[PDB]
């Protein structure tokens, strides 16, 4: 394997080490967002370790010598370390998981940012809009997937099931979104984003199916629209495709992808959503919120994010494709340091050229700003490259077969037992031709009302 596949694997090892693993904290295992943003986002940390997990998987499928075993073990244990660090980040907020379990309020939600040096909390609850069901759901989904891939207390198992209850009611819980700003208007208004709902559905499926299919109902109804205040969000690729695969309707997935391509895709990536204005030259940089009258200003000049084209390579790899047009179009990578791609966070219309871009959409030569490299995007870029170059397979990143969601599922035959409450009732049912068994006869199977089932689950997840 070292002839012509070990050298390229080592090249990707340098890529991941110099883009991702260089910034992993030896104490906590978390990844700071950038030099300016020293805090560690849950979702960004979960996504940024995908390249490391894929490299470890690559290294292992070819680990026979020691050195190769050493590299594979180092990568897998770095992934385990990052997930454990995020766990103690959530574990320290068990009082918030417990409170959000019953009262799903934005003031009782897990924080998105954490101190990358102590796994503690950096800002106050009031200070970031921490409710992001997608970050906790993506963490749970990849915890399920990594474990199903062979990556290894019961107290944290109880905590994980309490997190399952935490993200369980995500179909009816308003969220601050994957972009941690709620609605577009950007007034800190919690809103129900299909991205969060789909990620929660995927996490629950990978890890009670009633709320799962409630999330499925939300997804079917909302798609191809993102949420109440969004025609389309490019984050929906994380639901209709990798990593959630939460939509089992192939037509709906295709329609969502086509909406993203038609509305948000530009010369430098896909805009997050219409009238985003995250790093546009028209916003006020020092003003946190957005007045309702400046959202027009953001139209046709929204920043295009290269991160979303990593999703379009991932699907295309997960679903076989000649979408080798999404790759070869990511020549818009910063350095070709030495030659490291350094996938940018976004491209903004140069300020002078606002009128030309407004008028002539997706046509002006934008500049890269924001995080560089975008580790969430860079990890997906490296993973897609790995997968596309034959060093990885969909079944290794997805051992739970989440990709097989779109396949039509056959109708199910519901077995029903008609049970007589009393024997006299059984006698009447028989005179009329339905041969049944009484609830006493069905012993040792004990029939109970659904209230008892709901009460039983109240004893699941309890560690006092």
């Amino acid at each position: 394997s070292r002839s012509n596949s070990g050298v390229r694997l080592d090249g990707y090892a340098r890529l991941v080490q110099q883009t991702i693993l260089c910034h992993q904290n030896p104490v906590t295992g978390l990844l700071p967002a950038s030099y300016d943003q020293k805090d560690a986002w849950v979702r960004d940390n979960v996504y940024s370790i995908l390249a490391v997990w894929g490299l470890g998987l690559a290294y292992r499928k070819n680990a026979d010598r020691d050195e190769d075993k050493a590299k594979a073990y180092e990568l897998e244990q770095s992934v385990v370390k990052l997930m454990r660090g995020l766990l103690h980040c959530m574990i320290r907020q068990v009082d918030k998981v417990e409170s959000f379990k019953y009262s799903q309020s934005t003031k009782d939600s897990l924080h998105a940012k954490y101190n990358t040096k102590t796994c503690a909390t950096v800002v106050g609850d009031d200070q970031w809009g921490h409710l992001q069901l997608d970050a906790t759901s993506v963490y749970l989904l990849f915890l399920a997937q990594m474990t199903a891939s062979g990556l290894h207390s019961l107290d944290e198992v109880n905590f994980i099931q309490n997190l399952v209850f935490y993200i369980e009611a995500a179909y009816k819980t308003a969220d601050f979104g994957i972009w941690e700003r709620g609605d577009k208007t950007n007034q800190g208004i919690s809103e129900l984003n299909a991205s969060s709902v789909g990620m929660a559905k995927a996490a629950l499926e990978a890890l009670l199916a009633d709320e799962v299919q409630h999330c499925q109902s939300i997804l079917n109804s909302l798609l191809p629209r993102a949420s109440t205040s969004k025609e389309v969000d490019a984050s929906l690729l994380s639901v209709v495709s990798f990593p959630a695969f939460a939509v089992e309707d192939s037509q709906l997935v295709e329609l969502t992808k086509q909406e993203i391509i038609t509305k948000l895709q530009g010369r430098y990536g896909c805009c997050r959503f219409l009238r985003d204005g995250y790093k546009t030259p028209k916003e006020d940089p020092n003003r946190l919120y957005y007045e309702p009258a400046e959202l027009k200003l953001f139209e046709n000049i929204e920043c295009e994010w290269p991160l979303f084209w990593t999703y379009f390579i991932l699907d295309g790899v997960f679903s076989g494709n000649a979408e080798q047009v999404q790759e070869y179009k990511e020549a818009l990578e910063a350095v070709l340091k030495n030659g490291v791609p350094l996938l940018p966070e976004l491209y903004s219309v140069p300020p002078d050229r606002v009128d030309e871009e407004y008028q002539n959409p997706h046509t002006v030569d934008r500049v890269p700003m924001g995080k560089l490299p975008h580790m969430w995007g860079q990890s997906l870029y490296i993973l897609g490259s790995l997968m596309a170059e034959g060093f990885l397979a969909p079944g290794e990143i997805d051992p739970l077969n989440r990709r097989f969601s779109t396949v039509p599922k056959p109708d199910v035959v519901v077995q029903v037992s008609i049970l007589a409450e009393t024997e006299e009732i059984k006698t009447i049912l028989k005179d009329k031709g339905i041969y049944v068994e009484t609830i006493a006869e069905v012993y040792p199977i004990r029939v109970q009302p659904a209230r008892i089932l709901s009460h039983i689950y109240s004893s699941l997840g309890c560690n006092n």
Binding site: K61, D64, R65, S149, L151, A393, G395, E396, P399, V407
Partner: protein, 1033 residues
């Protein structure tokens, strides 16, 4: 005394009495220290090299050795790279021995000490001593582990592998043994010796995965043993373990095996059962007898005649030569096993028998013989006479093997070497440490066995995975596990064919056999990809047994139970339950779903299982890295195909006899008017004979129409046709031969052949093609439907012998034709007046339940005519039947005649011992001519009664030959007379009434027989006996 002085004492003895004799050229040591004999025996050189290495292990504890560590160690390498040379020159023979292990294809075990050339030929000497090839490999592992570099290049590694391929199949190669003669009788006969199989189990346990380069080693220097072949050696040793062979109930060669150097046995109760018999029956003042009735250099032995003639073996009883070396092995066993008083007891026994050379160096005489003038006195009072040494050392004669063992034992006893030092590979595992030693002990320990096999349910197609999920079972298609490759076992057999391939030495590779359930239960890294293999149970086959799903579910349970009982490797076993869409077709779905569901629950057959995704199951598991494949000659890596997703009558009316007397094209006429796939198989099977392989049929070549009817009724589950088809097309299963070895490894002998027809006796392991002649041509020449049913029972009995061995206890010769007879009768007794079902129409699984039911301990309830017919037909013997028949022969001067056979007191009493397995076979041969199976049970009962009368009454002894048939006839005639007095039954010479009478009861069968035996015994002298001298006399 300083250590230098303490060990200079041994260096003087080693250098004078052992290393002086080492060949300057070969490195091998000479058997005769003084003389013109050029013989270097393989075993004695290995023990001599071990003696020099033991001194080096001692001199390693001194930094200023003055060169003695390098010399003594490099002398050991010299002897071991000299045995390798002798073998490497005879590598034309290593290839021939892997393919056809035989007495005349073996590596020679005696070579010219000076040149390394073959000295004695196959006729002159019995060279098949696999104790020697196997101790070469145990010592090479134990010395390479110590730091001694014996294997130098990859070609030497390929020869050591080819040497391993030979040592794996020892269970099926009978040999001459450490003693070079075979049995106590020097008939020129090879027999399986626990000692040879035990050393092979130990070489294989030690060499599996041993870098033969040592510390300076990589993946391409490792030796790979077959977990399945090693199991077959473990199974053979344990079914011959308080004993040594069919001939020897104890041999002192068991002591080298059970304890240093091999330390093979893994049961502490068998070690004690084996050692105690060896010490009790073989120990002497001057040493341990090699075996009882041994004629080596005895005064009564004829020097000129090589082969002892029948009954000569008696002349050597009490005159047996006693070898002082066994005292040294017992001292080494004591140092290892922590008995500081077994070292002293046997040191004290050796200090007297030890001669000393002129310079004071101790000489361990090879044997101590009774001088001829004193032979009768020893025979009269054994242990009384004084036996002269064989070599005194001053004579110029030294036993180089014993000289070496003195150094090993004296150094170990004096604590100048440690048990750990001379057993670098830990062959001795102290009880408290018998937990995680691969191929021997598992985490659970020596006694507990609740293994959880790691099941992975793999589905042939996505369609089947989605179908199985709807019905409750999550399975994974071959593609969903993408990096992991699921391979048929046969694709690993192709890969292994490239292990040990040296074209310089003419070596070829692993022999092409099936990898089994303990080798398909491992995860392999072959050419950079992870390969897990589906078990051989899931391999498609022509035989009709495959069609019964119930047999597949049972083979899955049977395999997992074998994996539980016999997998002692580090990882959890990985069983992959390949599910094929054919398996769920029709009503096979309900049985398969219950197996698949129990596999999901975690228990199928008492074997706990963990079904999980292969990726999770293969994750931190130990993977056997198959690095021998390399690129080799071809610049391309070998092409290995991996399982891939398969993407989308009531009775035959035509009777054979009335339709075979016809030669007519009319058989081809009914062929067009037979809808019965059983009438078609009978009609289109008469013609595979009379008209030919291709006599044109309306359909086409006849060979194609029977294979179409066999295959068609196989699916339509029309089992009479499937069996007429298999037989007519002469179908044999790959598993008949692998299972017939379960019978043989377990000490049982299979007879194929019908009841009332030519039987044949497979007493030794045989090839599939020899076994096939025995079933379709040599034994069954009247009905070949019998060969398919007999093939069906060998497969069923073979797994029953492996997993439930005691459903076949009291059975030594398993007569499959007789067992089928018991089954046809059980169908009639079960049937009642309603006609009995035809065993042939019964489904393979229904034939397995009939067998399991007939084998079930006969319980209070059935007619004693039915109990007898089943027991007699199964040839079940009451426990100790064979020992009790010895006691009848010992107290009967002229022997027992049964059914025109005769067990005479001599030559058997003279040539055999009470518990000899050879005797059990002679008793079984004597009762061979008993055609009727219920008569066999009455004859087995007369013999059991004759044993109680003779034992309870020690005074009575038979004068003339006991005719067991006459004693039975006289018992029936008394019964006939007494029952006549009750009700005058008019049936004559019908013993049905007698057989139905219970054995013990008011007037049962046991009374009549006791009476008959007593009338015969009392017609002869009553010897006054002294145990209870007569009070009224």
């Amino acid at each position: 005394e300083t250590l230098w002085d303490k060990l200079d004492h041994y260096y003087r003895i080693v250098k004078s009495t052992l290393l002086l004799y080492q060949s300057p050229t070969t490195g091998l040591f000479p058997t005769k220290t003084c003389g013109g004999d050029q013989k270097a025996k393989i075993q004695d050189s290995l023990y001599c090299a071990a003696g020099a290495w033991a001194l080096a292990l001692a001199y390693r504890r001194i930094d200023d050795d003055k060169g003695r560590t390098h010399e003594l160690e490099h002398s050991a390498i010299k002897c071991m790279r000299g045995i390798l040379y002798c073998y490497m020159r005879q590598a034309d023979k290593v290839q021939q021995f892997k393919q056809d292990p035989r007495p005349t294809t073996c590596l020679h075990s005696v070579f010219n000490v000076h040149t390394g050339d073959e000295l004695l030929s196959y006729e002159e000497y019995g060279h098949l001593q696999i104790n020697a090839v196997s101790l070469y490999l145990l010592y090479l592992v134990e010395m390479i582990s110590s730091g001694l570099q014996i294997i130098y290049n990859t070609d030497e590694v390929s020869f050591i592998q080819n040497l391993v391929f030979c040592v794996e199949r020892v269970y099926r190669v009978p040999d001459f043994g450490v003693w070079e003669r075979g049995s106590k009788y020097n008939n020129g006969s090879t027999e399986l010796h626990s000692s040879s199989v035990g050393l092979a189990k130990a070489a294989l346990e030690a060499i599996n995965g041993f870098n033969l380069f040592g510390n300076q080693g990589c993946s391409w220097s490792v030796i790979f043993v077959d977990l399945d072949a090693h199991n077959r050696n473990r199974q053979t040793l344990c079914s011959l373990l308080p004993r040594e062979s069919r001939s020897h109930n104890t041999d002192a060669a068991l002591l080298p095996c059970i304890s240093y150097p091999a330390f093979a046995l893994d049961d502490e109760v068998l070690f004690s059962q084996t050692l105690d018999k060896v010490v009790r029956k073989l120990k002497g003042k001057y040493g341990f007898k090699r075996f009882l009735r041994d004629g080596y250099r005895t005064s009564l032995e004829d020097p000129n005649r090589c082969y002892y003639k029948p009954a000569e073996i008696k002349l050597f009883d009490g005159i047996e030569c006693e070898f002082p070396i066994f005292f040294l092995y017992m001292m080494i066993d004591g140092v290892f096993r922590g008995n500081p008083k077994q070292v002293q007891e046997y040191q004290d026994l050796l200090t007297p028998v030890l001669h000393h050379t002129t310079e004071g160096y101790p000489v361990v005489p090879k044997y101590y013989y009774v001088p001829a003038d004193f032979v009768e006195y020893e025979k009269n009072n054994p242990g009384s006479q004084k036996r002269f040494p064989s070599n005194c050392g001053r004579d110029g004669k030294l036993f180089l093997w014993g000289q070496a063992l003195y150094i090993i034992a004296k150094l170990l006893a004096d604590e100048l070497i440690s048990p750990k030092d001379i057993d670098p590979v830990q062959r001795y595992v102290p009880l408290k440490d018998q937990r995680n030693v691969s191929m021997r002990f598992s985490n659970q320990g020596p006694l507990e066995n609740d293994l959880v096999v790691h099941v992975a349910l793999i589905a042939e197609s996505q369609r089947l995975q989605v179908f199985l999920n709807t019905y409750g079972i999550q399975t994974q298609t071959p593609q969903q596990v993408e990096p992991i490759q699921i391979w048929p076992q046969q694709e690993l057999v192709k890969a292994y064919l490239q292990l040990g391939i040296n074209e310089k030495l003419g070596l070829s590779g692993r022999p092409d056999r099936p990898i089994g359930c303990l080798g398909t239960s491992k995860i392999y890294r072959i050419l950079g990809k992870t390969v897990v293999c589906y078990p051989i149970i899931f391999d498609l086959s022509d035989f009709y047994m495959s069609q019964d799903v119930f047999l597949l579910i049972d083979d899955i349970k049977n395999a997992l139970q074998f994996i539980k009982q016999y997998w002692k490797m580090h990882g959890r076993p990985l069983f992959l339950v390949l599910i094929r869409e054919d398996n769920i077709r029709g009503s096979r779905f309900n049985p398969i779903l219950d197996m698949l569901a129990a596999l999901k629950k975690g228990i199928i057959g008492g074997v706990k299982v963990h079904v999980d995704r292969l990726q999770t199951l293969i994750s931190g598991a130990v993977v056997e890295q198959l690095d021998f494949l390399r690129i080799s000659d071809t610049e391309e890596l070998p092409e290995f195909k991996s399982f891939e997703e398969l993407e989308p009558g009531q009775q035959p009316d035509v009777n054979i006899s009335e339709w075979k007397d016809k030669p007519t094209h009319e058989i081809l006429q009914k062929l067009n008017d037979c809808s019965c796939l059983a009438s078609q198989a009978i009609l289109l099977g008469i013609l595979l004979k009379r008209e030919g392989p291709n006599f044109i049929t309306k359909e086409g070549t006849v060979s194609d129409h029977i294979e179409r009817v066999y295959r068609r009724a196989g699916s339509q589950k029309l089992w009479l046709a499937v069996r007429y088809g298999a037989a007519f097309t002469q179908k044999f299963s790959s598993s008949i031969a692998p299972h017939i070895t379960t019978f043989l490894v377990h000490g049982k002998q299979v007879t194929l052949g019908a009841f009332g027809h030519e039987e044949e006796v497979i007493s030794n392991p045989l090839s599939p093609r020899v076994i096939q002649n025995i079933i379709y041509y040599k034994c069954n020449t009247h009905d070949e439907r019998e060969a398919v049913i007999q093939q069906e029972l060998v497969i069923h009995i073979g797994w029953i012998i492996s997993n439930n061995p005691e459903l076949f206890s009291g059975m030594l010769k398993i007569r499959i034709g007789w067992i089928i007879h018991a089954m046809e009768y059980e169908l009639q007794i079960r049937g009642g007046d309603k006609p009995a079902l035809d065993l042939y129409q019964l489904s393979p699984s229904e034939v397995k339940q009939l067998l399991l039911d007939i084998l079930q301990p006969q319980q209070n309830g059935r007619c004693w005519l039915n109990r007898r017919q089943i027991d007699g037909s199964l040839n079940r013997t009451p426990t100790g039947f064979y020992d009790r028949v010895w006691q009848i022969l010992e107290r009967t001067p002229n022997g027992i005649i049964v059914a025109g056979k005769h067990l005479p007191q001599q030559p058997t009493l003279s040539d055999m011992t009470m518990y000899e397995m050879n005797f059990s076979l002679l008793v079984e041969d004597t009762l061979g001519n008993i055609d009727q199976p219920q008569y066999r049970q009455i004859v087995v009962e007369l013999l059991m009664v004759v044993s109680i009368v003779l034992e309870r009454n020690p005074e009575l002894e038979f004068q003339d030959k006991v005719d067991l048939d006459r004693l039975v006839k006289e018992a029936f005639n008394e019964f006939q007379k007494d029952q006549s007095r009750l009700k005058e039954i008019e049936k004559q010479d019908d013993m049905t009434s007698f057989y139905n009478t219970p054995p013990l009861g008011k007037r049962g069968t046991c009374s009549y027989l006791t009476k008959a035996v007593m009338n015969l015994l009392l017609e002869g002298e009553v010897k006054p006996n002294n145990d209870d001298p007569c009070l009224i006399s």
